[PDB]
């Protein structure tokens, strides 16, 4: 009967779906309606249904109501094929009750995934009723939403009914938003919506230890896994649609928290977004899914920063508006509306590119050093490239490989590194799947052979991390031991503004297997092909590993100039190339994908560390014409101060910035100006006469006064 409960479902509805919000011949709506019209068609067509048949794993329920689900839009769309359909509605009516007497009431348990049970699936229950309160009683939508409480009597919890629970948190405990919050104003049982929104509190806090969000944008999740863009995705983009609804209610959430809103936005977000790609590293096992490319999910949160922005008052709006705006202007390669699965959202984004009046901004060049989490940010302003390098500490995990998903992903924090040039498709288009999983970019590794049952580690050592100095000068660390224990090296990046150094020494394994430096794997996309000169002069690879022995240069020049990467090596070394193009399914990591084989090619670079005390150590200057990139080297040439097996440090004299790590607690004389006292990263600029110091601890996440850890002589 009509009431104020269900005047918050109807918020709620649009939200969801967005047919109030709805045009005939609004062509970008027009092009989600063909897609429903074809889905809707595609499971009513079949049902119950053999694609979703088997029981027992428990995955395929949640698509039989997420199907059901698919009706209901249709079904309640005043523009649509199947708008008050007789059969339609019939198979839902006799589908959603013939489903809760047989598969989904009360006498029953958890097997396969709780998952289903108890989040993907109510969800799909909750707004199937939702969009049909009208084609559907009171009593009738209490009878169906009876097995939600079941499953789901508590919002601290989840896991209940079985036998070692645990606490809602990070993105996790959105869910127990939708999922409790829209079936309590169904069966308008009004705790359930006070009870449940003081729960949904308890994530707007930032912490020290643990998961959820961190004071330097670090969002740790699953015990400690990077997950700032696959979990964070879940976080923002679930609570940017109960927060319209939440806030009309009876006991809305007092504005203070909506602060840790934004500090999420700009410390956590913004910085993992670049062209319109939120970067893998923070996606973890994400990265293993077709569905879900580098471009796709980023817009998981730039719909989730807007929802945010509407819903805002004054320059707060305004600028997270410019926010959106701007970053989807920059991003050349992915229509951002094929990521809009609902018309709210798409004629709240058709209004920001018609509305001139937010202003675009350019990004300024920033660094942000994600030290609770070990994945470093950077992006060029000057030269419009981006750089990431995923690591992994004693704290944090090297990779995730949850539900058989992510089964190669071993070395992608082992040192990885990501750049980001002008080629936006080059982590995407079937990347993952065709890329060689042993040889990833910037790690070191010995070629004994993983399986695809292995699990996800830490380090054992902890000395890992960045010091920052400014928006374009920062230094990273590794005190490296591998999967096995077979190959420990040092391995220290030092990210310059328009280059990166990768030093690394001590060097050494106890091993039979050949270990192996990868300088580089860089997707090739075909129609613009690189044309790469070895040493200044041109070379033509294949599938042979050539050798290029003497080796000071080696450029990649392109038709786009902001495509091309160089490689200096600082003391001419003996690396291998080739090109080949290798071929992969995206089954392969991650079973429950399309084994339809897809081909991309690569072409690769490395360096092979024979005798036991070896060392590696070259510059990657991207966005860099030919031209200028040999009047770098030269400009660069006794650019290494140090690289040895306790110290390791680059100088740039154009800027004036040491990068400086040690691994003793020496007095190292650098650049004969200075010295540095003490185990740990520096960062240093002389602007003056005088010294710029950040010192980072990474051992105790910690830093120091300078008198502690530096003395500039005389």
Known sequence: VKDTYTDRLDDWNGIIAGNQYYDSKNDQMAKLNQELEGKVADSLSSILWEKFSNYKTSANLTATYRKLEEMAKQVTNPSSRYYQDETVVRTVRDSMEWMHKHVYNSEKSIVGNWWDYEIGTPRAINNTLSL????????EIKKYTDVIEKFVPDPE?????????????????????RVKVIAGLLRKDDQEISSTIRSIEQVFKLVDQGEGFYQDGSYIDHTNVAYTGAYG???IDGLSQLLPVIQKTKNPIDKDKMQTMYHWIDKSFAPLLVNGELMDMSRGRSISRANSEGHVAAVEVLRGIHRIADMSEGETKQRLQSLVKTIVQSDSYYDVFKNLKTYKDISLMQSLLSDAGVASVPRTSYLSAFNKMDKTAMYNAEKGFGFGLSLFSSRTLNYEHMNKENKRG???SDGMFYLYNGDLSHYSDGYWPTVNPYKMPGTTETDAKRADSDTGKVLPSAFVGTSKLDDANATATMDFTNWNQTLTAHKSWFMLKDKIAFLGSNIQNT??????????QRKLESSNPYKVYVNDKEASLTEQEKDYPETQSVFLESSDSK???????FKKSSISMSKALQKGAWKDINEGQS????????????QAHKQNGDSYGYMLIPNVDRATFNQMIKELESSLIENNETLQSVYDAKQGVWGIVKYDDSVSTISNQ???LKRGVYTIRKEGDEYKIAYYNPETQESAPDQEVFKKLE
């Open 563 to 569: 495509k091309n990467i160089g490689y200096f090596f």
């Open 674 to 676: 200075f010295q540095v």
């Open 233 to 235: 995705n879940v976080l």
């Open 410 to 412: 071993w070395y992608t």
């Open 511 to 520: 091993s039979t297997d050949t270990a192996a430096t990868t300088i580089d």
């Open 595 to 606: 084994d339809k084989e897809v081909e991309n090619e690569f072409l690769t670079i490395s």
């Open 132 to 139: 049909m309160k009208e084609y559907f009683s009171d009593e």
């Open 157 to 177: 919890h989840f896991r209940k009914t079985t036998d070692n629970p645990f606490k809602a948190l990070g993105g996790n405990l959105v869910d127990m938003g």
